[PDB]
Each structure stands twice: as C-alpha cells, then as structure tokens.
DNA sequence: GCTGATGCGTA
DNA sequence: GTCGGAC
DNA sequence: GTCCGACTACGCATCAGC
C-alpha cells in the first residue's frame, strides 16, 4: 500500500519494501511519500539516501518509469534545450483550486498568502467535484504526461484546457498527492533537494542496485561487501562519473537510456561533449575585495577580465556548418540571433571546423561605436526573428573556448584555452572582439583596472586562474571564477536610505512572517513617499523575525494619503511610514512601474534599484530624513551608461 | 484591435 | 541576479 | 565552499477580457 510507503526506513529493501509489483507503473503516491520524507529532514545526505531508495525500486521493478520520476524530482518537463514551459503559474493554479472546491477565488488566494504554500491550501480544502465512478490512482508516468500536456496547450481557450487537466489530477489525488501536485505546478516543491542531490541519489542508486538484471535482481546491495570507508570512496567516485558527464551533456533523455543499458562505469563512452548539445556553463563567486582575490588565488597566477553587462551566449558550430546558440540555462536561442549566425564566417580562421565559444552578447550602438545598457539588450525580440528587422545590434565579447575541431578543451587550463581562442579566431570591432583582459598580481593595477571597467560601461572584473585549477570541469567546481563588483566593496559605493511603506507575506521558508517589503524615497517637492523598489534579501533570519515583530504594530488598514506606489504590487499589509533602512544595489534603472523620481530624469518613467539588498536599520533617521527622490535622480545620472 | 494580467527567462 | 541557512 | 531556496527589476510573449 503506497500510503504506508516509507523510503526513509532502515535496511530499505528495493524489491520488498516497495509499494508496487514488478512491471507495474510506479504510483505517484510513492513519489509523494518520498517527497514527504525528504522535506522532513534537513541533511542532504539523508535526503539523497531517501531519494536513492525510491530510485532503486524503480530500477529493480519499473525501469521505464526512471525518467519521469527523475523529472518529477527535479520538477522539470524535459531537456532544457527543448524550451517546454508549463504556462501555468499561481494565477492559473489558484483558479483550478477554487473551481475544484467551489470556493471564492480570493478566499483561496488569501489563504495561500497566509499559509505561504499553495499545496497546503489544495490539501485541507474540500473537493466540490463529483465522480460517478472512483478514479484510478495517479501514476508517476501519467502525472508527468499530464504536465507535458499542459505545457503543450497553446492558442485560444488554452487556460480553460490547462485548468481542466489540473482539476483532473486533483480528483484522483490521495493523501499528500494534492499537496505536491499543486507545488509542482506552482514551481515551489520546497524539498531542499535539487539537481545536485538528484544526481547524487541517481549514481548511488544505480551503483547499489545495478540496472539490467533479470528479475529478481541478484545484486540488490553492491556495497554490503565493502567497508564503510570503501563504500564511501566508491560511491563518491561513481557520483563524479555521472556529475561530469551530466555537466557536459545535461540531458536526461540521453543519459538514462545509456545508463540502463551500459551502466554508469561505461557512461562516458557513450555520452560525450559535442557541439549542438548545450553544456553547463562556468559560474562565478562574489569577492568582497582585491585582498580576498589574492587570498583565494594565493600563489596561483590569474587574469582580470571585464564583466560585460549583457547576456551569456554559448555558441556552437557543428561539423557541417550548423550553428546553435544557447543561454546559460541551456535554452536554445538560435532563432534570436540571425545576425550572429551571419557573422560566424567572419570570426573563425578557414582551418576552424567546429567550436564551442563562451561569449557575452552585449547591445552595441553602431552609430556611436559604444556599449549600450542591459535594458536595451532585453528589447530584442525573443521568438524567431529575421535579420533585416533587427533594431538592437549585438557585439560578442568572447572569453573562453570549450571545444575546437572535434576535440574537447574541458580539461585544458585557461591559459591554453585562451591561447587557442585568440589564435584561431578573428576580431572585428563592434561585432566579435576578445574580452579586455589584464594579467597582473599588483593590487594597484587591479584597482585601476576595476575603475577602468566601470568607466568603460561594465559591471566590474572577472578573475580567473590561468594554470592552477583553471580547467572547465564544472563537476570539480561550478563557481571556479571570481567576480569583483564595486557594490561588493565596503565603503567604496553609494547606498540609499529608504522608508518601509508595506510588507508582503512570505512563502515557504518565509511562511508565517514577512518575505518582502515595499521601499520608498521621499519626494521633497510633493512631500510624498514614492515607491522605489521591493526588498526581500540581505537580512538574517533573526533580523527578519524582529522586523516581523516590530512592523506588525505599524499595520494600517488603508494607506496614508501621502504614499504613492502607482504600478507597484499592492502590499499585503500597509505599513505606517516609520522605519528607515540602508539599502545597497548594483545599478539604478528606469522603471516602468515605480514612481520614484518621476519627472526628474524622464517625464513618464520613474527610477528603481537593480539587485537591492538590506544592509542595516537606520534608527537615527525618520522618514523625513530618508534619501530624497532628487538624490535618487542624481545617482541615476552619475552612471556611465546613462546621459 | 487594443490592453492589461500572467508567465517566462534574462540579469 | 543577491542573500543567508544547514551542512 | 556546497547546495538550496527564499527574495530582486524588467521586457518580450501570450492570452483573456474589453
Ligand atoms: P554571475 O554574476 O555569476 O557572473 C557570471 C556571468 O558574467 C557574464 N560575463 C561578463 N563578462 C564576462 C567575462 N569576461 N568572463 C566570464 N563571464 C562574463 C557571463 O554572462 C556570466 O554568466
């Protein structure tokens, strides 16, 4: 009985402790009970083993259901390069809950905001749907198929057809299924277990219970013959095999069939990096100063590069001439850049047959020959576009080469990857140039280079080692680069003091308290408080709780007449304007919804804050002494990318 | 035909 | 994108 | 440091309502 399924017990037997016979469709309640055990605990090692116990039963009993269970665990619809999206958020989901329960739409919405979780609302609610015959139980493969049916619905009356499928899943839900069905559609499973733990559990499962055995499986625990140390070392080595293969081929549709046929030890023989298949990109960790760079990169030689304010473009050139461009989320952006594809012959030497370039697509003004801000880049059409209709030109800033002429450069150091990039590729001003770099260890040269990058319309500096731990192996370390921005440096930057005028009820980890706040600057001329941005990060859990304690005494039934928010989200609790906080941000943007400093730089648009975070409470200041809207306008114009 | 709410994907 | 929490 | 899930602004694409 899947209701009593306990994949977190001691001495879990993949065959006998399961809740379905061999060859049967894996019941979705087995996935739901697994999700229950995972969210109860907080140690990743316990979560991985609990999920591994489920996958071992799937491997031993119903191998065809391995893929949908893995996707349901990740809450994904398929490979990222296929661009499958549900099209369902909280708006559609809360409507499907109301129709399924006969409740008012706002009653469900208010309860969802109060409880901070939509899945809890769908669970305690009472179904108003009557069925002539009791529905069959949900299966993991059937539920996963319905999700892809919802994602496949487009056109007129799509919402009603999506809602019907969601309501069809709810009438067949048993026990905790409705809770996790709603969370999946809401996109907030709240497991504490994501892509890294799903892979860790997959490699542990296929290692302890090897696939491809005749039933019943002869080897059910391949680690019982090993010591605790030998078992740990072996499982860790098996985990790296899967992690590095998935880092180069993040496609479960390609790995899982190979895995069930040739095992994990022979997986690299059948799944290899190749152009046309997106790869996991290299990420960066923040650095709070030039001194910390030399500390993290002690002894090792590194290079400083401009950090361009654009969108990452992973450009693949296949053997044959086909070109594909992927985002850093492995989304296919080929149709977005007809101009880049036209430019490919201009960037490579005639000996270059195939490559994978790591570049930054930046909006480029061809009349003035200068970089344009990130907001200009986002105005480009996203769907299939034609090159003749392009209005915002892009310039590619290449900084790495991952693949060259049938050979992978993943395990080559950056010094060689960079050398191969600049030997085989041709620069063109305003179209394809190599990222501005500086090889140095001097603190004053790095400081001057950081100031020069901001003056040259860039966010700051990227710092990468050249020879020591300088490979492109994401499984070794996904954040092996360093980023140095001015807003990271203590004292070297501008911060704003804004008034808290509203609060937003928190979700998930913030459930039961405030998850966000609405901030405002003081407009001197109109003597009003103008909403500038929302704030929801920068404070500790202890600080957030004290914010929730004191601000509850400031809850107003209706807003004060001198508070202007315009198009901003109406706060859940209006707050009497009293608390003033210091806020840090990366940039100031021209906002389509916030009224702060409207008319001071633009007649229609106001100003907002890019990447805002809470620093400290300013008990010394009252709302009259907050940062003025005129000062907000001054800070916006002092930016290099702005007139 | 237009607009606004919703969803998604970039940072 | 930033951030803190649990490990 | 790793992994994870809270949270930010904003613009295109989509679709329901007018
Ligand atoms: P995130 O804040 O993790 O930073 C990494 C992204 O920065 C962009 N980027 C701009 N310029 C560079 C250079 N020179 N090297 C590497 N990355 C750069 C990329 O789009 C990254 O996604």
Residue numbers in the entry: 262 to 904
Paper text:
Of the three human DNA ligases, DNA ligase 1 (LIG1) is the main replicative ligase playing a critical role in the maturation of Okazaki fragments during DNA replication and finalizes DNA excision repair pathways with an ultimate nick sealing step. ATP-dependent human DNA ligases catalyze a phosphodiester bond formation between the 3′-hydroxyl (OH) and 5′-phosphate (PO4) ends of a nick in a conserved three-step of DNA ligation reaction. Huntington’s disease (HD)-associated mutation in the LIG1 gene, K845N, is associated with delayed symptom onset and predicted to suppress CAG repeat expansion. Here, using biochemical analyses, X-ray crystallography, and total internal reflection fluorescence (TIRF) microscopy, we characterized the LIG1 HD-associated K845N variant at biochemical, structural, and single-molecule levels.
In addition to a comprehensive biochemical characterization of the LIG1 K845N mutant in the ligation assays, we determined its structure in complex with nick DNA containing a canonical A:T. For this purpose, we used the LIG1 low-fidelity EE/AA mutant that harbors E346A and E592A mutations (LIG1EE/AA) for crystallization of the triple mutant LIG1EE/AAK845N. In the ligation asssays, we demonstrated no significant difference in the ligation efficiency between LIG1EE/AA double-mutant and LIG1EE/AA K845N triple-mutant. Similarly, in the structure of LIG1EE/AA K845N/A:T, we observed the ligase active site at step 2 of the ligation reaction. The overlay of both LIG1 structures demonstrated similar confirmation with a root mean square deviation (RMSD) of 0.560Å. The superimposition of these structures also shows a similarity in the DNA conformation at the downstream of the nick in the absence and presence of the K845N mutation residing in the OBD domain. We did not observe any large scale alternations at the ligase active site due to the K845N mutation. The distances between the functional groups of K845 and N845 side chains are calculated as 17.5 and 15.8 Å, respectively, relative to the 5′-end of nick. We observed a 1 Å difference in the distance between the K845/N845 functional group side chains with regards to the 3′-end of nick. These findings suggest that the LIG1EE/AA and LIG1EE/AA K845N structures share similar configuration with the nick site containing a canonical A:T, and therefore, the HD-associated amino acid substitution at the K845 residue likely does not impact nick processing at the ligase active site. From the superimposition of the LIG1 structures, we conclude that the HD-associated variant K845N does not directly interact with the minor groove or template strand of the DNA as shown for previously solved LIG1 syndrome variants R641L and R771W.
